[PDB]
Design a binder for these strands. Structure first.
Ligand SMILES: [Mg+2]
Ligand SMILES: [Mg+2]
Ligand SMILES: [Mg+2]
Ligand SMILES: [Mg+2]
Ligand SMILES: [Mg+2]
Ligand SMILES: [Mg+2]
Ligand SMILES: [Mg+2]
Ligand SMILES: [Mg+2]
Ligand SMILES: [Mg+2]
Ligand SMILES: [Mg+2]
Ligand SMILES: [Mg+2]
Ligand SMILES: [Mg+2]
Ligand SMILES: [Mg+2]
Ligand SMILES: [Mg+2]
Ligand SMILES: [Mg+2]
Ligand SMILES: [Mg+2]
Ligand SMILES: [Mg+2]
Ligand SMILES: [Mg+2]
Ligand SMILES: [Mg+2]
Ligand SMILES: [Mg+2]
Ligand SMILES: [Zn+2]
Ligand SMILES: [Zn+2]
Lengths: 102, 81, 151, 25, 63, 225, 129
RNA sequence: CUCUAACUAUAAAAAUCUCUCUUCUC
RNA sequence: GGUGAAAUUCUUGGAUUUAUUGAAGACUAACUACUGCGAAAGCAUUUGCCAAGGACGUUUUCAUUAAUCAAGAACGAAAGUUAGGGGAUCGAAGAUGAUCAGAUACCGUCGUAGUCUUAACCAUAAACUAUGCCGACUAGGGAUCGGGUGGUGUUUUUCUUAUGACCCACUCGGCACCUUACGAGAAAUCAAAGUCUUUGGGUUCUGGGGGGAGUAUGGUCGCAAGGCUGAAACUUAAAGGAAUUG
């Protein structure tokens, strides 16, 4: 039976979208059923911020960030802990998991 | 809502609804009398005109075709018919 | 909201005013309006352009309101009605244009389907104009006849 | 079984039978 | 949990009614601020109701 | 990891004894003209080093050339063409952004508009310039998206293209670079399209280079000192 | 400037055998190439942070002997059609490079990112594991 | 009745199973 | 290199990485969304040309010309087939190196046909919204795309204005969405799957337990692959749908 009224795709009026590959297993999966995660982070972690600051010329370097949108498959997304199985009454909710920190 | 007048709905609701959906369907358009600074002739034009209307005396456009209604020529003075 | 040859559902149209008689503010003469229609037709204009010219440049809301006859009816009374009705002629022109575009490039299949649609519409309108006997019963549509009628 | 592979096995039986008929046609 | 002393204290605190009026324009020198719309409401109600008009600057905050 | 099947299909020295340092000299259009040092093999009569330096492309941050930090995210490639002995002279070769800033401004819920133009400057230098712009949410837009229609995008691309053609055909990459440093072209492009669409973050990125007439000695020595 | 002789650190960290490869400003001159697999035994802990740590210490010693005192970090992932996410070792390589006296300037990420080109390895269903 | 910030990151191998199923009314 | 871990493989003829560049072919990242166009497949770099199209505006024109459709036709993903062109990547077959009791499977490295194209075929997909099309009515809440109306609205700046971009209100059309049952269902659920025992708006196609079987035969299309049409003999008391507790 229908487990998802949206079918998981989130297409609703296209018929076909262009697939994208998984970052882990390289699964040719449609771009909308290709759960996306925008990893924006520091090129140097908080573990080495002090070390870099003490041992860097150009006092108060901006310490540029790194940006990458990861296109996971769905099997990896279940397994690589990105997305989790949910209650059938919890599948309703599409909001992100409540603002990890405020 | 269960009891309500359709024979005499409010005129505000009349202007609220779409054309072709009133009690009796009536256009929302109207005509205008425009005067061009050139001569004293009064030209009758349409609100939603589709052509570059000019006075017969002078080759000066008075309206301009537009996806909706007419945009005038920045100097003509009109009165609603 | 039918859109005979597509999936459209629009209803964009015009609502004819309730009052059939002439508008109170109109001062022109019906005979003058008929003369204007005749002159516009003699210029080589189809009835729709005649109506648009009368609505824009003049106070003619619509010919039937002012004169009592329709534009094509007025032209026919004076013997200026074209031998092919305007809508069918425009369909012929569109069909010949798409056929020209097709013969100038073969690989375009979408315009081929659109030409099929236009030809179906032409056939339907020709059938209607044939049962009313506007067109002779031998009137039909093939290649090089559309060009002859258009040119 | 899958309908796909049953279909394919039928197609291979038709392979053999068509070759046999072509030999004896 | 609750007991006689605590509920009596709660009731006595509840019975607090301020002597000074917190309504009927006791503040703002017997003038209360409104906009046009509720002013026309008062007018159409056929009541005098001393008011003070102020436009609400229909531009809404971007939040 | 010593494992090596020695599928080879001591005469060892220290290569650093036969090497030395040259100095990189920036164009006068930049302030901090002392760029850095480059390691080079020692000069040999049969194979002179001075032939080997020319053609080198050094990549330096723009802020390293002007001292400020407003030019932190840009980057400039200089070409080694003429060596004066223990000090070599560099001409402009190209310009680019830093990937960090580029990814920082390429954000969701706004359309990026790219204008690409290949032109010829006042001299015979032939350049290719890329401009990138982003639609801006208005200071009153309660609507949370900031998308732009295709017509607006095409108009913006046309305007940026004509502006770049104008500002390249009217000057040389000496003057063109002296114009790029205060990014007045970005401001001009933003102002020319103020009526069409807001266009936040109008930037000129990856100023390429495709041709060079012969050598252009006199202006090259004139560009330095 | 107080005559800080500059180089570019130019770390390359794949998911196995990270690279630390310092060069001059031009980049045409290569010195102190010593890699992650250069210094570990397990043939697979080449990507481990300790391998990059040891490689970074070696390049720091070599370049300090050379005369270069400050370096420019150019972090590169494996790039191309692959995962193009930075390897586990390169981060520790950068930390160890910043540890050993060397000064740090203009960290950049120079991973090669494509315009969705050259179909990825793995087949339509990809690596099944 | 007043707000848009923090972040990562493991996939070794594991095939198979025989009986026999039995009422609910004051 | 690569991996769970290894090995096959390339390397002091100096590989892996390092800088400029050059060649080829494919692709069009990030922008990319419960967003758009199209009859469906499908469509994502820029510019020009070619024609086409939906929606809206219309006091323009014809006056039933229309809805669905046996026969007939046009397109029809991928794969595949003839030839000519190319030949980067990835990769059916194959070659191996591993894992295993076996592994000619999954992990790995090479690797033809193919992938990319110009003509000619093919007409099948979980070609799915598993919901035919046209038409009417029925319930509340926001947003979103295209168009159009009004604002004594706001920033824009070209002194003011005109645009544009927003803000508020309304309307038409579209992909959609939230709540609810007061309706429908065997329920999962549906704002249509409602207005159906209080059973009739028009109309086309399909199904009558499971298997045999979409098999044989006979036609018909195709170079071939195969497509369309398509039973019976016989066997069986179930097969199947949704949901509840373990
Ligand atoms: Mg299931
Ligand atoms: Mg999903
Ligand atoms: Mg659609
Ligand atoms: Mg698994
Ligand atoms: Mg080499
Ligand atoms: Mg793109
Ligand atoms: Mg769009
Ligand atoms: Mg049929
Ligand atoms: Mg093919
Ligand atoms: Mg071939
Ligand atoms: Mg094999
Ligand atoms: Mg084997
Ligand atoms: Mg394989
Ligand atoms: Mg390969
Ligand atoms: Mg089928
Ligand atoms: Mg079906
Ligand atoms: Mg049966
Ligand atoms: Mg069956
Ligand atoms: Mg047969
Ligand atoms: Mg079941
Ligand atoms: Zn995956
Ligand atoms: Zn005049």
């Amino acid at each position: 039976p229908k487990k998802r009224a949206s079918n998981g795709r989130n297409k609703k009026g296209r018929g076909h979208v262009k697939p994208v590959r998984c970052v882990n297993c390289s699964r040719s999966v449609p771009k909308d059923k290709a759960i996306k995660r925008m990893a924006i982070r520091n090129i140097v972690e908080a573990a080495a911020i002090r070390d870099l600051s003490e041992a860097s010329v150009y006092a108060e370097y901006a310490l540029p960030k790194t940006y990458n949108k990861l296109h996971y498959c769905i099997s990896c997304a279940i397994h690589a802990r990105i997305v989790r199985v949910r209650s059938r009454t919890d599948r309703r909710i599409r909001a992100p998991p409540q603002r990890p920190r405020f | 809502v269960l009891v309500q007048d359709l024979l005499h709905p409010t005129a505000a609701s009349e202007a609220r609804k779409h054309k072709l959906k009133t009690l009796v369907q009536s256009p929302r358009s109207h005509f205008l009398d425009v005067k061009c600074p050139g001569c004293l002739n009064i030209t009758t034009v349409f609100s939603h005109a589709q052509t570059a209307v000019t006075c017969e005396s002078c080759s000066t456009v008075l309206c301009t075709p537009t996806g909706g209604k007419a945009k005038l020529s920045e100097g003509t003075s009109f009165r609603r018919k | 909201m039918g859109r005979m040859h597509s999936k459209g559902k629009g209803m964009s149209s015009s609502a004819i005013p309730y009052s059939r008689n002439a508008p109170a503010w109109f001062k022109g003469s019906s005979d003058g309006v008929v003369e204007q229609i005749i002159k516009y037709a003699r210029k080589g204009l189809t009835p729709s352009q005649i109506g648009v010219l009368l609505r824009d440049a003049h106070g003619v809301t619509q010919a039937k309101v002012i004169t009592g006859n329709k534009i094509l009816r007025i032209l026919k009374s004076n013997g200026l009605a074209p031998e092919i009705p305007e809508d069918l002629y425009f369909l012929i022109k569109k069909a010949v244009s798409v056929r020209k575009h097709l013969e100038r490039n073969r690989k375009d299949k979408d315009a081929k389907f659109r030409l099929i649609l236009i030809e179906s519409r032409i056939h339907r309108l020709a059938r209607y104009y044939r049962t009313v006997s506007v067109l002779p019963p031998n009137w039909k549509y093939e290649s090089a006849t559309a060009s002859a009628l258009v040119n | 079984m899958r309908a796909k592979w049953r279909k394919k096995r039928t197609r291979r039986l038709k392979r053999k039978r068509r070759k046999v008929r072509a030999r004896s046609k | 949990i609750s007991f006689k002393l605590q509920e009596e204290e709660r009731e006595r605190k509840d019975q607090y009614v301020p002597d000074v009026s917190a309504l009927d324009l006791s503040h703002s020198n017997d003038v209360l601020n409104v906009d046009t719309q509720t002013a026309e409401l008062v007018n159409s109600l056929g009541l005098k109701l001393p008011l003070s008009v102020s436009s609400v600057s229909a531009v809404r905050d971007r939040r | 990891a010593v494992g090596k099947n020695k599928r080879l299909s001591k005469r060892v020295v220290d290569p650093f004894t036969r090497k030395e340092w040259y100095d990189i000299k920036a164009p006068s259009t930049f302030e901090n003209r002392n760029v850095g040092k480059t390691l080079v093999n020692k000069s040999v009569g049969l194979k002179n080093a001075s032939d080997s330096l020319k053609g080198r492309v050094v990549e330096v941050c723009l802020a390293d050339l002007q001292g400020s930090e407003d030019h932190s995210f840009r980057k400039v490639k200089l070409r080694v063409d003429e060596v004066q002995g223990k000090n070599l002279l560099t001409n402009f070769h190209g310009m680019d952004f830093t990937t960090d800033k580029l990814r920082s401004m390429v954000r969701k819920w706004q359309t990026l508009i790219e204008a690409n133009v290949t032109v010829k400057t006042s001299d015979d230098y032939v350049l290719r310039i890329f401009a990138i712009a982003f639609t801006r949410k208005q200071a009153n837009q309660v609507k949370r998206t900031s998308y732009a229609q295709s017509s607006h995008i095409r108009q913006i691309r046309k305007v940026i293209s004509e502006i770049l053609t104008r500002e390249v055909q009217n000057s040389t990459l000496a003057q063109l670079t002296s114009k790029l440093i205060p990014e007045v072209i970005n401001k001009e492009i933003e102002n020319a399209t103020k009526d069409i669409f807001p266009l936040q973050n109008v930037h000129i990125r990856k100023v390429k280079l495709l041709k060079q007439p012969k050598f252009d000695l006199g202006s090259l020595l004139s560009l330095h000192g | 400037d107080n005559s800080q002789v500059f180089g570019v650190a130019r770390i390359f960290a794949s998911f196995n055998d990270t690279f630390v490869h310092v060069t001059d400003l031009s980049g045409r001159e290569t010195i102190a190439r010593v890699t992650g697999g250069m210094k570990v035994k397990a043939d697979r802990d080449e990507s481990s942070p300790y391998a990059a740590m040891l490689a970074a210490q070696d390049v720091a010693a070599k370049c300090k002997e050379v005369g270069i005192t400050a370096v420019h970090i150019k972090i590169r992932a494996t790039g191309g059609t692959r995962s193009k996410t930075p390897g586990p070792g390169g981060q520790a390589a950068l930390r160890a490079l910043a540890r050993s006296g060397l000064r740090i300037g203009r960290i950049e990420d120079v991973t090669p990112v494509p315009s969705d080109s050259t179909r990825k390895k793995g087949g339509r269903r990809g690596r099944r594991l």
